[PDB]
Amino acid sequence: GSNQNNF
Ligand SMILES: [Zn+2]
């Protein structure tokens, strides 16, 4: 699956 990390 697609992953996004918004630190
Ligand atoms: Zn994946």
Q: Looking at this protein, which amino acid is placed at residue 6?
A: N
Q: Please give the Cα distance from 1 to 6 (Å, whole number).
A: 17
d(CA 6, CA 4): 6
Q: What is the resolution of this structure in A?
A: 1.0
Distance, CA of 3 to CA of 7 (rounded, Å) = 13
**What's the CA gap between 7 and 2, in Å, rounded?**
16
Give the CA diameter of the chain. Answer: 19
Locus of tokens 């918004």 = 6
Q: Which two tokens stand for residue 7?
A: 């630190």
**Spatial distance between the Cα atoms of 6 and 3, rounded to a whole number of angstroms:** 10
Measured in angstroms, how far is the CA atom of residue 5 from the centroid of ligand 1?
Answer: 13
CA of 4 to the centre of ligand 1 (A): 11
- Per the entry, the structure determination technique was electron diffraction
State the distance from the centre of ligand 1 to the C-alpha of 2, rounded, in angstroms: 5
